[PDB]
Amino acid sequence: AETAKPATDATKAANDALLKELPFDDKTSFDLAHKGFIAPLPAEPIKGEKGNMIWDPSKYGFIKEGEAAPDTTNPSLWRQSQLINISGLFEVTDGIYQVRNYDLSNMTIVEGKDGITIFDPLISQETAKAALDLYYKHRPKKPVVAVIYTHSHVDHYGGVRGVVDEADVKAGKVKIYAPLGFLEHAVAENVMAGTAMSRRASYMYGNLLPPDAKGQLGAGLGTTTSAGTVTLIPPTDIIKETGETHVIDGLTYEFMYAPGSEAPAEMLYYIKEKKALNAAEDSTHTLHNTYSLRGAKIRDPLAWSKYLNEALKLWGDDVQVMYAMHHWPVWGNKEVREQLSLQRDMYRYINDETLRLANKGYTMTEIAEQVKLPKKIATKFSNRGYYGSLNHNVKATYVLYLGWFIGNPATLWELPPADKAKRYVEMMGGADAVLKKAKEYYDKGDFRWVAEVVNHVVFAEPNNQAAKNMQADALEQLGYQAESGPWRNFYLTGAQELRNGVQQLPTPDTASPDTVKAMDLDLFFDFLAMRLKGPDVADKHITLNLDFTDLKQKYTLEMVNGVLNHTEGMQAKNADATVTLTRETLNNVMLKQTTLKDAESSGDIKIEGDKGKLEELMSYMDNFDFWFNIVTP
Amino acid sequence: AETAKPATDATKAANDALLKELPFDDKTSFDLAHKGFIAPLPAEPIKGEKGNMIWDPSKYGFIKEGEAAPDTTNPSLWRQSQLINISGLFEVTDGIYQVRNYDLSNMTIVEGKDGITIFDPLISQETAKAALDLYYKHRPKKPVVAVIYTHSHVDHYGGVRGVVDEADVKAGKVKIYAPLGFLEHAVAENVMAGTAMSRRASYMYGNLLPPDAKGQLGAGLGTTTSAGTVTLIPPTDIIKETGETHVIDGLTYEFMYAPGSEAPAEMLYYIKEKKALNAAEDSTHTLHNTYSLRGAKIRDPLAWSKYLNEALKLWGDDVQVMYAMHHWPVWGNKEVREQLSLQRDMYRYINDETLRLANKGYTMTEIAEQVKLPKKIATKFSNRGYYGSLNHNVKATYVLYLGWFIGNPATLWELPPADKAKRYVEMMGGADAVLKKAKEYYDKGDFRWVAEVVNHVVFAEPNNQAAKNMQADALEQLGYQAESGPWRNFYLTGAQELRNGVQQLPTPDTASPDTVKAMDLDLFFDFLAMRLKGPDVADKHITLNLDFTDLKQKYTLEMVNGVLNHTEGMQAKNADATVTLTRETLNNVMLKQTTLKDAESSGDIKIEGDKGKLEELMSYMDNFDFWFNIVTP
Ligand SMILES: [Mg+2]
Ligand SMILES: [Mg+2]
Ligand SMILES: [Zn+2]
Ligand SMILES: [Zn+2]
């Protein structure tokens, strides 16, 4: 089995060119990333109760500040990887602390009148607990009086039970603040397309790669994701509009409601006494994703720009420090305004130039080839595509406005990848001839082309290892050149799977107990409907009446024409069966705590009518192999 | 120039195979389309002042009921084309009338206590006026007391000035009802990606083609769009929620708010006293567009399915007739329930099967190749893809959840069309070799392949007329096979432009006066920003303070880093200029009814400071040529 190759001369030249374009002599990022350092993270890796690795703080130890970029790494991404590994407890300003790099995200702690308020308690309960214990090792041991979730992604709420006990939330001693839409979007994320998204995420975050100079370097936005217990306590206080002001633990918070920017539900806020702005995840030290390669709904760069502009309008004159839920802070009114201004301009440029070029008749990939950020934006390291990339953001923006079809009817009804591949290979003279021609292009450094054309040989002949080896070599050079962590990881993971095959592993975790319980029945029934093997059951008809005795809510589920419909507040006259149960019992079955059959046996699920129909319906539900092929058919 | 070819044997076989799958002996569609006929449309074509054609009622006269489908037409689309040409004034039920095929859409008239209420007054004021005149020739001359726009597309409001005088709306004599988000979306649709959308629409609606058996047949949803004066009066009353009920002219309307279905702003409603359901454009006698090839944001088929399911829940037991804003009604409670139920199932099937296959690892085009509607749905003519197609809807649904990128990094950074074209052609032995090889595939009927591969020769060598001729022949055979009107039109227009070149004809110089007047300043300034030639002005900086005296509002415009930002409620300190004006004055400059220089000279635009900086900003704005290339670079 083939292994990683050296960087080609073409790769070295491409990376070296970046040294002239970017000001690597400027070390400002490092000063800011080290500023306010209090204490390092514990060296001991965090392990779960079951012995699983949750967080290894030395994972990317090979990446050291002061060490030159290996020639198999983009030097800008190497610089960023050094920066994101600067870890520990930091002071941002008087009374505001952050723990950085104990997870993908930062945890923030604000000292108020009587206690502390926690922002965005990481992905895992275990990392959040460790981050809070670190804070308490150095700062006074005062109670948590409030938690804020800045937005609806898992790395900003997942560890909540590690910092607060829900008994205190219920008793009114601790309030949890979140933007309008938080709960619905947090819970629904990774449900409907969860297997596709998580398998794609295994490429994105480089989880399958070795951490080394020819492997993964980190995700640009943070190093990687923890792998512990995801928890969720529903918020008690909802922020619904910008201008909203609340006193929390004696400090005055003014909010900006920012839906549809980086996340569906998101908010930024200013603490007036500290002249300190929380930019959430809308301004960090990278160009971010207006579209994530993991696979997600495409975001609106214009809305994002306008939120940054509104932040300037509201706080620009007064702000003294800006911090965010990833990366390090920026200090000084002038400096804060510059970051906000350049990033505002950057997201607007993506929007407006994509639209202008589309109105001129350019199509998706042509527009992405042309759009280049102005020098004043592009020469700041904070605006480089370490997580997002300009190219895939621009493509996504064309799709946001005009969809997938580029208008040329030659592209309306193309054959699928494996089918077109066979025809391409045939017309180019066969697999051997394609590889020989592709080699010439490779030696000229045209790896973008080699990766496209050799992909046809692979999809036509997936057992051709010579083809897979060459495709891997091409992807790998592109990986070596990639400034985006996610780009590098997609390329290098593709190369690895082509050389070695897909490694057979456990499906990872699926849905946390808290997440499942917070899921409304509408979402649950849509998820079951997604799993239905429609073509297998198109001629069949099952109607079930469900009665949830605790909720006093009734539903009709109707499997008909190969789909599963649901309706709240109805009961069918002619149902095959009536199913009576509590919501708790349903959660128990979905969390695989009891089987459907045992729930029926025990009487927790009572059935009137055809006793077999619920089991029958469930027997038509698909199951997904997590490790589906990506770089081969 | 080459011209249209006969149908090949492969095309005849593909079309003939459809006769075995669909019940062509069922004439229900025709019975329903003829039911309630009162009077025909006037035979004389509607012409504008310059004798421009606005509406020719004989345009598709060659398509006659009872006449066999020509072998260059899909027999299912031929059937639908006969149906949509059934024209005139019709009674739906007591007090509800429609005028059908005086435009792409229907106009509906409902008789109430004291007057009439008009729904969806067509595209052009001239067709809407003629439609109302026809009604008034056969029913009592009673005043219009209300207008309803069911959704935010131009064929459902554009002729409004033909049915009501805006003076009567201002007087409070006529109310105009619309769904929440109507005005924002209607104006944005006309404006932001307007050149791209309008040029793509020239393909979609077959406007450039001759109406004959080898040319355009109609759009499936309706014949074609009128070409008269597009107008807009902003609504007075906004429907925000599904519970919502209003008594309009002595009749009770119960509304369903249906955002993100066929349009971003859409509503359905039931008139209680008449047991009559208006399905807007969410249930018609075609599979519709969850994504429009014209270019638009992708829609949510799950939401669409759920709206149809909710209509069943709310009105299913009571409803006696359902009508819509395109096509003909369905009568009878059983029959209405069946159409709603089958279409509900169809849109859910598209959503759920796409997700399930994506979760199994299938990618966009692979999924679209596999998904096939179940027999009970697919064998009803009302569910065939005459406007939408299952294939492009399924592709869009993948993109809705997962975006443009299919996960395989070989496709992450492809070369643009012209650049990859050159390389494909080189590796296939040159243009002549490709054309000779492609002919073999063509003769085997593999037109989907020929259209993809010969497209490379065209993009590599745009002046190669032999290549363009072969590409045209392949597209044309696909056009002859298409069941979707928009598909047929895209294919046949592409063929025509390849054979003949792009034929330029007069198009509008600006947006309509009513469109511009309805635009809010946020949109106005975003549209200017889109036009900014960023790369040309990246190093320049212009700041303008605006004061709108009629509004009592101030703005700052800032051109910086190649973008144009705007901020409401701010004035910058050392601005280049302060500009004082009214919205009317600003609109006239955009509409080219006045000149900026003259508006300044006359005193309508008062400027302090650098009086030429506004002129300078305008000089940097791009202009768009409508007739951009689609089938050649
Ligand atoms: Mg596959
Ligand atoms: Mg072009
Ligand atoms: Zn995050
Ligand atoms: Zn319409």
The DSSP string of B284-328 is -SS---SS-TT--PPP-HHHHHHHHHHHHHHHTTT--EEE-SSS-
B580: tokens are 């004082």
Interface of B with A in 409-438 (CB under 8 A): 409-418, 420, 423-424, 427-429, 434, 437
DSSP H helices, A252-316, are: 301-315
Distance A632 CA to ligand 1 centre (A): 6
What is the CB-side half-sphere exposure of residue B489 using CA atoms within 13 A? 28
First to last CA, chain A: 20
Distance B72 CA to ligand 2 centre (A): 30
Task: Give the whole-angstrom CA distance, residue B56 versus residue A542.
Answer: 51
Q: What is the dihedral of CA B379, B383, B388, B394, to 10 degrees?
A: -70
Please work out, in degrees rounded to the nearest 5, the angle formed at the alpha carbon of residue B353 by the alpha carbons of B350 and B357: 135
In angstroms, what CA-CA distances link B626 with B142, B550, B553? 43, 34, 35
User: Which residue type, as a one-letter code, is found at position A390?
Assistant: L
Residue B601, judged by CB atoms within 10 A of its CB (0-12, 13-18, 19+), counts as exposed
Task: Give the whole-angstrom CA distance, residue B520 versus residue A136.
Answer: 52
User: Which residue type, as a one-letter code, is found at position A165?
Assistant: D
In angstroms, what CA-CA distances link A304 with A268, A283, A287, B529? 12, 9, 12, 15
Which DSSP category does B161 fall into? G
A451: tokens are 């990766």
Angle, helices A447-460 vs A465-481, to 10°: value is: 150
| Stretch (H or E) spanning A454 | helix A447-460
What CATH number should be reported for the domain whose range is B362-502? 1.25.40.880
For chain A, say whether B405 makes contact (Cβ under 8 Å).
Answer: yes
List residues bridging with A566 in a β-sheet: A557
The shortest C-alpha distance from B520 to chain A (Å) reads 16
Residues 6+ apart with CB under 8 A from B465: none
Cα-only R_g, chain A:
26
B71: tokens are 């072998």
Count of helices and strands (H, E) across chain B: 22, 21
Which DSSP category does A87 fall into? -
Residues 6+ apart with CB under 8 A from A358: A367, A398, A401, A402, B193, B196
**Cβ atoms of residues B500 and B494 within 8 Å:** no
Distance B485 CA to ligand 4 centre (A): 14
Task: Give the whole-angstrom CA distance, residue A333 versus residue A347.
Answer: 21
Which residue intervals of chain A bear CATH 1.25.40.880? 362-502
Interface of A with B in 307-346 (CB under 8 A): 309, 312-313, 341-342, 344-345
CA torsion sign for A354, A355, A357, A362 is positive
B209: tokens are 């083609």
Task: Give the whole-angstrom CA distance, residue B117 versus residue B135.
Answer: 12
Residue B51, judged by CB atoms within 10 A of its CB (0-12, 13-18, 19+), counts as exposed
Give DSSP secondary structure letters for B462-498: TT-HHHHHHHHHHHHHHHHH-SSHHHHHHHHHHHHHH
Task: Give the whole-angstrom CA distance, residue A618 versus residue A603.
Answer: 18
Task: Give the whole-angstrom CA distance, residue A111 versus residue A139.
Answer: 10
Q: What is the dihedral of CA B604, B605, B609, B615, to 10 degrees?
A: -130
User: Distance of alpha carbon A381 from its chain centroid, rounded?
Assistant: 22
Q: How many CB atoms lie within 10 A of CB B577?
A: 21
For chain B, say whether A296 makes contact (Cβ under 8 Å).
Answer: yes
Task: Give the whole-angstrom CA distance, residue B499 versus residue B503.
Answer: 11
**Cβ atoms of residues B312 and B334 within 8 Å:** no
Q: How many CB atoms lie within 10 A of CB A279?
A: 26
**Cβ atoms of residues A497 and A88 within 8 Å:** no
Among B304, B405, B439, the strongest candidate for a mutation testing the A interface, having the largest count of A CBs within 10 A, is B405
**Cβ atoms of residues B421 and B457 within 8 Å:** yes
Distance A123 CA to ligand 2 centre (A): 45
Residue with tokens 């000149």: B595
Tell me the backbone φ, ψ of residue B196, rounded to 5 degrees. Answer: -55, -50
Rounded to whole angstroms, the maximal C-alpha distance in chain A is 77
User: Distance of alpha carbon B52 from its chain centroid, rounded?
Assistant: 22
First to last CA, chain B: 20
Which residue intervals of chain A bear CATH 3.30.1050.10? 503-633
Give contacts of B569 with chain A, Cβ < 8 Å.
Answer: 313
CB atoms B372 and A192 under 8 Å: no
Task: Give the whole-angstrom CA distance, residue A258 versus residue A261.
Answer: 6
Of the candidates A184, A139, A149, A145, the one whose C-alpha atom is nearest the C-alpha of residue A165 is A145
B317: tokens are 């037991």
Q: In what order do the strands lie in the sheet with A330-331?
A: A245-248, A251-257, A267-271, A276-278, A321-323, A330-331
The shortest C-alpha distance from B631 to chain A (Å) reads 5
Which DSSP category does B272 fall into? G
Domain B503-633 = CATH 3.30.1050.10:
yes
* Beta-strand relationship, A144-148 and A175-179: parallel
User: Which residue type, as a one-letter code, is found at position B351?
Assistant: N
Give contacts of A352 with chain B, Cβ < 8 Å.
Answer: 529-530, 532, 534, 563-564
Resolution of the experimental model in angstroms, please? 1.8
Task: Give the whole-angstrom CA distance, residue A100 versus residue B202.
Answer: 54
Ligand number with the minimum distance to the CA of B158 = 4
Distance A55 CA to ligand 3 centre (A): 17
Task: Give the whole-angstrom CA distance, residue A317 versus residue A322.
Answer: 13
* Beta-strand relationship, A553-560 and A321-323: unpaired
* Beta-strand relationship, A541-548 and A577-581: parallel
Of the candidates B511, B513, B577, B586, the one whose C-alpha atom is nearest the C-alpha of residue B545 is B577
CB atoms B475 and A410 under 8 Å: yes
Which residue intervals of chain B bear CATH 3.60.15.30? 1-361
* Beta-strand relationship, A553-560 and A541-548: antiparallel
CB atoms A449 and B423 under 8 Å: yes
Strands (DSSP E) found in A40-141:
46-47, 53-55, 88-93, 96-100, 107-111, 116-119
In angstroms, what CA-CA distances link A581 with A554, A574, A596? 11, 20, 12
**Cβ atoms of residues B127 and B226 within 8 Å:** yes
Q: What is the dihedral of CA A239, A241, A242, A247, to 10 degrees?
A: -40
Of the candidates A331, A338, A324, the one whose C-alpha atom is nearest the C-alpha of residue A35 is A331
Rounded to whole angstroms, the maximal C-alpha distance in chain B is 77
Of the candidates B624, B459, B112, the one whose C-alpha atom is nearest the C-alpha of residue A355 is B624
CA torsion sign for A57, A59, A60, A65 is positive
Cα-only R_g, chain B:
26
Task: Tell me the three state secondary structure of residue A177.
Answer: strand
**Cβ atoms of residues B297 and A401 within 8 Å:** yes
Tell me the backbone φ, ψ of residue A145, rounded to 5 degrees. Answer: -110, -15
Residue with tokens 């008749």: A361
Tell me the backbone φ, ψ of residue B616, rounded to 5 degrees. Answer: -65, -45
List residues bridging with B451 in a β-sheet: none
Please work out, in degrees rounded to the nearest 5, the angle formed at the alpha carbon of residue B304 by the alpha carbons of B300 and B309: 145
Residue among B195, B297, B309 whose CB faces A567 most closely: B309
DSSP H helices, B19-73, are: 28-34
Residue with tokens 């590796």: B427
The shortest C-alpha distance from A382 to chain B (Å) reads 16
| Stretch (H or E) spanning A17 | helix A9-21
Distance A361 CA to ligand 2 centre (A): 6
| Stretch (H or E) spanning B333 | helix B333-359
Q: In what order do the strands lie in the sheet with A144-148?
A: A37-39, A88-93, A96-100, A107-111, A116-119, A144-148, A175-179, A237-239
Interface of B with A in 549-578 (CB under 8 A): 560-565, 567, 569-570
Tell me the backbone φ, ψ of residue A588, rounded to 5 degrees. Answer: -60, -40
Task: Give the whole-angstrom CA distance, residue B36 versus residue B89.
Answer: 8
Tell me the backbone φ, ψ of residue B507, rounded to 5 degrees. Answer: -135, 160
Residues 6+ apart with CB under 8 A from B420: A449, A452, B414, B456
User: Which residue type, as a one-letter code, is found at position A131?
Assistant: A
For chain B, say whether A243 makes contact (Cβ under 8 Å).
Answer: no
User: What's the fold here for domain B1-361?
Assistant: Metallo-beta-lactamase; Chain A (3.60.15)
Q: What is the dihedral of CA B186, B187, B192, B195, to 10 degrees?
A: 80
Q: What kind of experiment solved this structure?
A: X-ray
What is the CB-side half-sphere exposure of residue B355 using CA atoms within 13 A? 28
A525: tokens are 């029934």
B47: tokens are 């012409």
Task: Give the whole-angstrom CA distance, residue A160 versus residue A269.
Answer: 20
Residues 6+ apart with CB under 8 A from B626: B195, B198, B199, B507
**Cβ atoms of residues B444 and B10 within 8 Å:** yes
Interface of A with B in 512-531 (CB under 8 A): 526, 529-531
Q: Buried b vs exposed e over A367-393: b needs ≥16 C-beta within 10 Å? A: bbbebbbbebbbebbbbbbbbbbbbbb
Of the candidates A538, A618, A489, A594, the one whose C-alpha atom is nearest the C-alpha of residue A201 is A489
Please work out, in degrees rounded to the nearest 5, the angle formed at the alpha carbon of residue A587 by the alpha carbons of A586 and A592: 100
Task: Give the whole-angstrom CA distance, residue B203 versus residue B71.
Answer: 22
Of the candidates A231, A110, A101, the one whose C-alpha atom is nearest the C-alpha of residue A160 is A231
Residue with tokens 């399911």: B309
